[PDB]
Design a protein around this ligand. Structure first.
Ligand SMILES: COc1ccc(-c2nn(C3CCC3)c3ncnc(N)c23)cc1OC
Length: 238
């Protein structure tokens, strides 16, 4: 996994803050993402951003596949938001579901699944790479599980369907926590089918063991326009 420092060229800054992320070149021939300051060495999946190489002595360098559109959150908010429509958004949701199903199967917990933590490439490829996105049992008692990730996935569906807005518009953290424990849940967002809001509701069940698996979510999302909304019609935004 270890590569020589002189094999890397750092071209453009992409982000900063703990360290930075650059776009660059590996071995003079490969566009890569470079980040400066073991799970990533074990995990492998087409919907998981792929580690390429490391420089493991301070100053440390992490080298992964390049994702050309930046974060899903940035992508949704930018020039592309205006044009995404439910079939695109449902498709991206399904890809992430697929990523998380691999994580499910491998026995890992992600713990911070949300749009800022997903990357987007060419051709709408999406890949896996604070109260408001967190399941109550996780936020309150540190019970982080795949089931709390499923909760976050529910919140990400709303980010997808509102094209990147903050969940719980106008409420502050303390307000979200209090309200959600009292049984509040986000209503159906404008022009988004009730059947998809119902999936969100399934992710936000109080009993973490009653929430759907990712394998279930992936299959539902892949099949959505044949099995669930065979008669869908694009509207003004979705
Ligand atoms: C855990 O390691 C990383 C996680 C995310 C990114 C990453 N971050 N970024 C941008 C910085 C804000 C999103 C990327 N852009 C394109 N491709 C990428 N792979 C990235 C880079 C990483 O290392 C190269």
């Amino acid at each position: 996994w270890e590569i020589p420092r002189e094999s890397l060229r750092l071209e453009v800054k992409l982000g900063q803050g703990f360290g930075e992320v650059w776009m660059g070149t590996w071995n003079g021939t490969t566009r890569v993402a470079i980040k400066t300051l073991q799970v990533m060495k074990k995990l492998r999946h087409e919907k998981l951003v792929q580690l390429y190489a490391v420089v493991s002595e301070e100053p440390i360098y992490i080298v992964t596949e390049y994702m050309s559109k930046g974060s899903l959150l940035d992508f949704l908010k930018g020039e592309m938001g205006k044009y995404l429509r439910l079939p695109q958004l449902v498709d991206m949701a399904a890809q992430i579901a697929s990523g998380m199903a691999y994580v499910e199967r491998m026995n890992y917990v992600h713990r911070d699944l949300r749009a800022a933590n997903i990357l987007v490439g060419e051709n709408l490829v999406c890949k896996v790479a604070p109260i408001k996105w967190t399941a109550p049992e996780a936020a309150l008692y540190g019970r982080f599980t795949i089931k709390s990730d499923v909760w976050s996935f529910g919140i990400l569906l709303t980010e997808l369907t509102t094209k990147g807005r903050v969940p719980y518009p106008g409420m502050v953290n303390r307000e979200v926590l209090d309200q959600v424990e009292r049984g509040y849940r986000m209503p159906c967002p404008p022009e988004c089918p009730e059947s998809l809001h119902d999936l969100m509701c399934q992710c936000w069940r109080k009993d973490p063991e009653e929430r759907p698996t990712f394998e279930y979510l992936q299959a539902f999302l892949e099949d959505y326009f044949t099995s669930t909304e065979p008669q869908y019609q694009p509207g003004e935004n979705l």
